[PDB]
Ligand binder design. Structure first.
Ligand SMILES: CC(C)(COP(=O)(O)OP(=O)(O)OC[C@H]1O[C@@H](n2cnc3c(N)ncnc32)[C@H](O)[C@@H]1OP(=O)(O)O)[C@@H](O)C(=O)NCCC(=O)NCCSC(=O)Cc1ccccc1
Ligand SMILES: CC(C)(COP(=O)(O)OP(=O)(O)OC[C@H]1O[C@@H](n2cnc3c(N)ncnc32)[C@H](O)[C@@H]1OP(=O)(O)O)[C@@H](O)C(=O)NCCC(=O)NCCSC(=O)Cc1ccccc1
Lengths: 304, 248, 248, 304
């Protein structure tokens, strides 16, 4: 028998009543949300680095101003997500420390390097594109604070995704060298963007509980398919290609059928062995450690 | 029209170069809130640069903010030496910011009464932002100088290390003076009293000392820069130099 | 001819990029003697870059060492990821140098028996220099690791921090393999035993530890670089990008 | 009456017998040579910085290789000069410390910034040019170790001066932008190069004793005139100008008559208030302090 507390919760979930910070929740539900919201928050912070790599080099003042706004918005999004995680009783400072130590994750996508300006527009387009699909799907996540954080964030983020696409369009309509730059950035970021949706549905340990508890409203594979279906026509609009020999339209199902993800790479990446894992965490550790005297100054001044 | 163009460009270059510096902080700050704040200030200043440079390009009758930012070399750039100083540690960034913000506040307050309508409008926008910048920079000056023993020393060192470049803030050449007599520019020498009243009080309140060194470094306005500017521009202009004359 | 050109270019790029890094040390070293030594090594490596790049340009039938160094972007550069690492502290510079020198010694020893006469000659010159480089880098590894408690830790940290990039030293692609079967290139996988016998002994003698992390980072040879290379090139190529096609 | 020791010395100087480290010398002669050789040595070290500023940016590999060799030679020259100063009983480590603290000087010329590649060729041409005139004049300086150090050094240095001139020639024969770059570098470095010869002959406190003791063989003004006479034709060969409205040939004397030096600037510069004084000493202090652990490692390892 479920306990009365357990049963009431299951019934609240079934009726789509938002769970709030003061409501009883299964300890495993509390913890998987600290895990997920916390790693979502971590991702906004680490996500500043690949794009921020190009702030000082951005080719026009307009694109530089857009990128600066976008990196600022990401920081703001991290803050919203940390607040939401804290409603579950964890501490921002503690989960951040776990992030720095490698005991909590952040999104696989931020372990890829920005090797050209085109990469910046491609991140805004594909990476924010994948984020938005995931996040809009989460606007009906069962935990109130999380769902409301997704609402606040998607409003701002869809703007920046459009700006990244427009930056891609300029390259697509520009010189031959610009077109080539764009294609190369797509070739390097396409599969990494698809991996943001997580593992396949039968290699996904958190899904059974997350789906049942309506944390996850659509399966990783469902969201990934939706992203491919939505994004392929945008690739076409740019006159570009996808690095996928197996991508084709299936008239019978109404979906794009696409190639197999390199799951061996994905497992390397999420376990700290991707292209930039070490550099990303080093930069964040360096910021934290070198900033210590500033945080201590702030605390010591507040007290006086 | 040449003088007005050069004057406008100077104000643009200050904002552009300082914006570049603040850009380097993205994701490297002591707290997420400071990351946010520094990026905000960077963004405001870049907005001001675009405004000033756009007007300078319109004044010269050719080019735009991008030809100006990306196709001039360090002998043509006319920013203050102060804004090109490296970020160093957080105190160094705060000292540079506080000195510039106090100056921006004093300047834009007066330049919003410029007989040049575009200069007046640009300054009316900028002043509102500089006031936000000054609250933040003065705030941190006070938190660090009157923080710990260690932050107090770093903040004193930061002030000492930048002081010599403050002379340029009140340096007037014949562009300044001529435009000031037409009621168009602000004569930088007449900014000293307001800048000093602000900065001396802020340093005092932070429990710090005004340096006794007489500030002596100028040349930025004339394209005579420290060795810092060249590598900044090499980084800022790279892609435009590689792929000139394109749309982005 | 395409494979040989790419292979030659890789060896050039390694020497070029590492030379650039050593250049940054000029006048910033712990002792005047180290300033001298680092500049000497920088100079040797640049000499090797010119040799390899000149031959690559001759192989391609167009351009020269300057078109190659200054007009390629980071996706075309083919240096090892190791040589593009920042200088960091003196231990970091010494670790990077020791790993590369040990590798250069093992490589040039074998490449001087290349069935390609120009490759053989270039390697015959380079080997004599790499031997000098290795004595100096191994010398400092030992002095620092078996110096003070503090230098011992910095040297261990330096080794740890660069280790993951050592995998590329023994990475073979089809250019390596195809040229090696024609007796032209050295198959990098067969360099492991000599590099490890040298490096493991040097680390041991310095009273330090070989990292237990399995090295896993490659991509430099394919133009897939760390985020360090771009800003290096922005600085290295600036003047040529601004003023292309000139004589200097 | 001079003492017998004092008289023998005066006689040795008159007969041009080189003074050696074990010979008696007036204490003021010992000290002015520690002053001068030491500041000469300091200059080689600080002199690495303005040129070294351009090593990573040099426009061709050939010019980059030349500059690297040249900066290396300078370091070597510092070493020779420190050895020579030590024969007088001072310690390299102590006079270097005095340099870092601002209690000993180095050449005024190294407080000027390199703002373009042309500045590098101009330094090799004008700055080494002025150094060579000074140093060749010192090959008959009365103190043996100093004179022999000048012999060793001028051999290597005249090569690099020629290379700097050749770098200037390439710009002079190049595009319009290159020609302009060259002229601007000359405009900025001409007067600073002339100031390397020191103050005028009636504003020069060390000359009376230095000339008498045959430390200085030609007056500051004599050497400066010789440099102007030798260099003006080289400016002509480049098709360039000198930033001197008062420069003209005087057929009657056989010399170029040239304008007044800005002595107010010169006094600002040598007293630490030039364009790069602070940056130069900061870089050297930073190198010294950050290098401390390396020097201590080396000492502690040697002892074991
Ligand atoms: C879908 C999933 C990521 C994973 O499904 P779950 O059911 O939770 O897990 P599942 O059992 O399926 O997986 C097995 C294990 O591996 C995990 N893992 C899977 N995939 C990844 C991955 N790709 N990266 C790293 N780890 C991954 C997973 O955590 C689990 O390990 P764990 O048990 O935790 O140790 C879910 O957590 C979610 O939707 N999170 C919220 C979205 C979010 O975090 N967005 C942030 C990026 S967007 C952004 O920052 C905006 C932006 C754009 C541009 C620039 C700047 C900013
Ligand atoms: C001619 C003079 C410099 C000065 O005559 P004296 O009879 O000694 O003094 P006098 O009474 O006339 O002057 C009053 C005071 O001010 C001094 N002062 C004057 N001028 C300068 C000045 N320009 N900078 C700074 N200080 C100056 C003087 O020391 C005295 O102060 P003190 O009482 O010491 O506190 C003499 O010392 C000499 O020939 N030295 C050897 C040459 C040498 O040092 N060469 C190094 C540069 S070349 C190189 O490094 C190669 C290279 C090229 C390119 C790149 C890299 C490397």
């Amino acid at each position: 028998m479920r306990s009365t507390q357990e049963e009431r919760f299951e019934q609240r979930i079934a009726q789509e009543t938002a769970i709030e910070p003061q409501d009883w929740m299964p300890d495993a539900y509390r913890k998987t949300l600290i895990r997920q919201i916390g790693q979502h928050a971590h991702s906004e912070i680490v996500g500043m680095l690949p794009e921020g790599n190009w702030i000082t080099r951005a080719p026009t003042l307009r694109r530089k101003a857009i990128l600066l706004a976008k990196v600022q918005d990401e920081a703001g999004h991290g803050l919203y997500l940390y607040s939401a995680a804290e409603t579950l009783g964890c501490a921002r400072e503690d989960i951040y420390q776990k992030m720095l130590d490698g005991r909590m994750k952040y999104s696989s996508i931020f372990n890829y390097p920005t090797l050209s300006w085109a990469d910046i527009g491609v991140i805004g387009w594909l990476v924010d594109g994948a984020a938005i699909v995931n996040q809009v799907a989460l606007c009906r996540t069962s935990y109130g604070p999380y769902a409301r954080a997704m609402v606040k964030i998607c409003k701002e983020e869809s703007f920046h995704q459009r700006q990244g696409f427009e930056a891609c369009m300029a390259l697509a309509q520009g010189s031959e060298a610009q077109k080539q730059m764009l294609q190369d950035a797509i070739n390097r970021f396409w599969w990494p963007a698809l991996m943001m949706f997580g593992p396949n549905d039968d290699n996904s340990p958190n899904s059974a509980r997350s789906l049942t508890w309506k944390i996850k409203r659509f399966t990783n594979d469902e969201l990934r398919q939706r992203f491919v279906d939505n994004t392929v026509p945008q690739v076409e609009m740019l006159g570009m290609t996808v690095p996928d020999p197996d991508l084709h339209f299936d008239t019978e199902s109404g979906h794009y059928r696409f190639g197999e993800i390199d799951w061996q790479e994905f497992n390397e990446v999420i376990n700290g062995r991707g292209i930039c894992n070490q550099e990303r965490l080093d930069a964040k550790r360096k910021a934290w450690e070198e900033g210590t005297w500033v945080r201590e100054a702030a605390l010591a001044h507040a007290q006086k | 029209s040449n003088q007005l163009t050069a004057y406008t460009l100077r104000l643009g270059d200050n904002c552009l170069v300082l914006s570049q510096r603040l850009g380097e902080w993205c994701g490297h700050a002591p707290e997420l809130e400071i990351d946010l704040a520094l990026a905000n200030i960077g963004l405001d200043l870049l907005g001001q640069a675009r405004n000033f440079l756009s007007y300078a390009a319109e004044l010269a009758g050719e080019g735009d903010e991008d030809t100006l930012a990306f196709t001039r070399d360090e002998r043509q750039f006319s920013n203050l030496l102060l804004v090109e100083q490296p970020n160093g540690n957080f105190a160094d960034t705060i000292a540079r910011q506080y000195f510039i913000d106090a100056w921006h506040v004093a300047l834009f307050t007066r330049l919003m009464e410029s007989r040049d309508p575009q200069l007046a409008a640009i300054s009316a926008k900028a002043i509102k932002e500089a006031r936000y910048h000054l609250r933040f920079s003065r705030g941190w000056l006070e938190r660090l100088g009157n923080g710990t023993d260690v932050s107090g020393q770093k903040m004193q060192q930061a002030i000492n290390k930048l002081w010599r470049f403050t002379a340029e803030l009140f340096d007037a050449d014949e562009i300044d003076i001529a435009l000031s007599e037409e009621g168009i520019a602000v004569d930088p020498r007449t900014l000293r009293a307001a800048w000093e009243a602000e900065v001396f009080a802020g340093i005092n309140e932070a429990t710090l000392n005004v340096p006794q060194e007489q500030a002596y470094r100028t040349g930025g306005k004339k394209g005579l820069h420290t060795e810092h500017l060249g590598p900044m521009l090499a980084e800022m202009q790279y892609l435009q130099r590689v792929l000139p004359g394109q749309q982005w």
